[PDB]
Amino acid sequence: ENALLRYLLDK
Amino acid sequence: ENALLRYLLDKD
Amino acid sequence: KENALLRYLLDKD
Amino acid sequence: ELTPDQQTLLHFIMDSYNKQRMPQEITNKILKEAFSAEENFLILTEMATNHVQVLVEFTKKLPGFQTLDHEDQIALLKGSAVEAMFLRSAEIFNKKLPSGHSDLLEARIRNSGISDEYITPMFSFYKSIGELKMTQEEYALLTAIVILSPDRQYIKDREAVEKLQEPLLDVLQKLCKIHQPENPQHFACLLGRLTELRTFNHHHAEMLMSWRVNDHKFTPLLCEIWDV
Amino acid sequence: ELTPDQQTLLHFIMDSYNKQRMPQEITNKILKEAFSAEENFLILTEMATNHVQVLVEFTKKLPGFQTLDHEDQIALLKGSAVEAMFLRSAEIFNKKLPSGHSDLLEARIRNSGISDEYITPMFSFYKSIGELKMTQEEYALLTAIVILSPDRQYIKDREAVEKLQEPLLDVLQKLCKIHQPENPQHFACLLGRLTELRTFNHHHAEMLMSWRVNDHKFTPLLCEIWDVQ
Ligand SMILES: CC[C@H]1[C@@H](O)[C@H]2[C@H]3CC[C@H]([C@H](C)CCC(=O)NS(=O)(=O)c4ccc(OC(F)(F)F)cc4)[C@@]3(C)CC[C@@H]2[C@@]2(C)CC[C@@H](O)[C@H](F)[C@@H]12
Numbered sequence: 001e002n003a004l005l006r007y008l009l010d011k
Numbered sequence: 012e013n014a015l016l017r018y019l020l021d022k023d
Numbered sequence: 024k025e026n027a028l029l030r031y032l033l034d035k036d
Numbered sequence: 037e038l039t040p041d042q043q044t045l046l047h048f049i050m051d052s053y054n055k056q057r058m059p060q061e062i063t064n065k066i067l068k069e070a071f072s073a074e075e076n077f078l079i080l081t082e083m084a085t086n087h088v089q090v091l092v093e094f095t096k097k098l099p100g101f102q103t104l105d106h107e108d109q110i111a112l113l114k115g116s117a118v119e120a121m122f123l124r125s126a127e128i129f130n131k132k133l134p135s136g137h138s139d140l141l142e143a144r145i146r147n148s149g150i151s152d153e154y155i156t157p158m159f160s161f162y163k164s165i166g167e168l169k170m171t172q173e174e175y176a177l178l179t180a181i182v183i184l185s186p187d188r189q190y191i192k193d194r195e196a197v198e199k200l201q202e203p204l205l206d207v208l209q210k211l212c213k214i215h216q217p218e219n220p221q222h223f224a225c226l227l228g229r230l231t232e233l234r235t236f237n238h239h240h241a242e243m244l245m246s247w248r249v250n251d252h253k254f255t256p257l258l259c260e261i262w263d264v
Numbered sequence: 265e266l267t268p269d270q271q272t273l274l275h276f277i278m279d280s281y282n283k284q285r286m287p288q289e290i291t292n293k294i295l296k297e298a299f300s301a302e303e304n305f306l307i308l309t310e311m312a313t314n315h316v317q318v319l320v321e322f323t324k325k326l327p328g329f330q331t332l333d334h335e336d337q338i339a340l341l342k343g344s345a346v347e348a349m350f351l352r353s354a355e356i357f358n359k360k361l362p363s364g365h366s367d368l369l370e371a372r373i374r375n376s377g378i379s380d381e382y383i384t385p386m387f388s389f390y391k392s393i394g395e396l397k398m399t400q401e402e403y404a405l406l407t408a409i410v411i412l413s414p415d416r417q418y419i420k421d422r423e424a425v426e427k428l429q430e431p432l433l434d435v436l437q438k439l440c441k442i443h444q445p446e447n448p449q450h451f452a453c454l455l456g457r458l459t460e461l462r463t464f465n466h467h468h469a470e471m472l473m474s475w476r477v478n479d480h481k482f483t484p485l486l487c488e489i490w491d492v493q
């Protein structure tokens with residue numbers, strides 16, 4: 001789940 | 012301000 | 024910097 | 037043709053350009069997922085959000101970009117980000133992109149709680165970018181040229197940025213001449229549209245005040261870059 | 265055609281742009297002074313100097329220029345003088361060959377101590393602005409549009425500058441619909457020339473660093489304006 005992309009996507 | 016953007020620009 | 028002549032032209036024409 | 041220093045530089049930019057593309061997990065939600073205004077607004081903000089990250093990585097890799105003042109560095113990325121999303125949009129909706137994948141994205145964008153009043157002109161502009169028949173090499177450079185703009189607010193060393201955009205312009209211009217000797221004002225008609233890109237900047241600010249669904253929220257990095 | 269407000273705007277721009285031309289004595293040296301690198305240099309530095317003065321007078325009369333921060337006005341004036349001379353240069357070397365001068369103006373430029381490497385690009389571009397076939401109202405506007413550019417360094421209040429430009433743009437853009445309806449992307453190949461003009465600004469600075477002629481300093485106002493040394 002792409003370590004950086006999730007978190008960035010986590011509103 | 013732009014702490015996330017600065018992080019992306021500065022992270023390796 | 025200053026722009027001293029350019030200022031003189033801009034002010035009193 | 038291009039010179040040996042304008043070919044290394046070309047080659048390099050194209051690599052970093054094609055380096056990252058959309059992660060599957062997003063490309064799955066575009067095909068195989070709910071077609072509500074809500075949810076579409078979700079896919080499109082996931083997408084937007086990937087796109088800055090991919091941008092910030094391409095930018096980092098611009099020749100000599102990390103020489104520059106770190107304060108300038110933010111100001112260019114904040115400055116160019118909406119403009120690069122519009123430009124990549126343009127390229128997207130012309131692309132030799134195959135069967136219905138972009139038809140699909142066009143259809144989601146129109147059921148995601150944006151007015152046809154904003155939605156209609158942005159494609160209408162994408163149409164005209166298209167007419168100018170650009171190559172991925174051309175899109176990649178113009179994208180670099182718009183990031184390395186030295187005329188952006190809060191640039192403290194405008195000279196350092198133009199010593200980087202100049203090559204990129206040289207290269208683009210030459211390749212306009214190589215590509216298209218038919219009519220020789222083609223380079224100028226490229227740049228002219230880069231200026232048009234800047235117009236939409238504030239339109240984008242506006243429409244964002246109206247683009248809320250479910251009482252949802254954009255993602256944090258979107259709130260930084262589009263300032264919402 | 266254009267609108268009553270767009271015509272009261274155009275009428276006052278045009279006048280100023282014509283309000284003052286080069287003093288008879290300066291233009292007379294083009295035709296009558298000894299023809300040497302040195303002499304030409306001094307002839308051209310003089311036209312330069314006077315063009316800046318004409319430029320400042322043309323600008324103060326622009327509608328609304330004086331409501332700006334008196335600082336943002338300086339900042340506009342400084343960061344467009346080199347480009348407006350570019351706009352102007354091109355027009356001159358594009359009219360119906362006056363043949364009573366103009367050609368000798370060029371003849372003095374290739375013999376005044378500027379690189380051949382730098383000169384032949386410049387006339388190349390000035391021809392490209394001819395393959396737009398602009399009028400004096402279009403040259404006048406483009407000019408005005410160049411001075412009132414909020415993208416300039418050290419502008420504090422851009423939206424103010426940004427507010428004064430757009431009407432100028434819309435009138436230049438309505439004039440292009442009329443004069444060339446058989447190319448809608450044409451008002452867009454003016455806006456590209458404006459970005460092109462900027463790149464030459466830097467070329468014009470680096471060249472200055474070479475352009476010397478047996479000592480012979482520039483006029484003080486050129487050194488302020490062109491940031492010489
Ligand atoms: C009404 C038109 C729409 C569209 O516009 C729409 C799209 C259009 C396509 C956009 C993707 C994010 C592209 C993502 C990509 O393409 N990633 S990517 O990973 O493949 C990649 C990245 C960068 C890149 O370039 C680089 F390498 F970085 F240089 C190369 C590849 C988009 C989903 C954004 C929202 C935007 C929006 C709904 C919003 C408000 C208005 O603003 C718009 F009008 C409006």
Ligand SMILES: CC[C@H]1[C@@H](O)[C@H]2[C@H]3CC[C@H]([C@H](C)CCC(=O)NS(=O)(=O)c4ccc(OC(F)(F)F)cc4)[C@@]3(C)CC[C@@H]2[C@@]2(C)CC[C@@H](O)[C@H](F)[C@@H]12
Pocket residue numbers: 280281282284285286287308311312314315318319320322348349352353356373378382383386407468
């Ligand atoms: C190698 C190309 C050359 C030329 O370029 C050359 C010329 C080109 C023509 C210039 C005149 C000053 C125009 C005279 C005029 O036109 N005044 S004027 O009084 O008739 C008038 C004013 C303004 C005006 O507009 C306004 F209303 F003010 F806005 C309207 C009329 C010029 C003598 C300057 C030097 C420049 C230079 C040698 C060096 C700087 C380089 O960069 C160039 F490359 C290089």
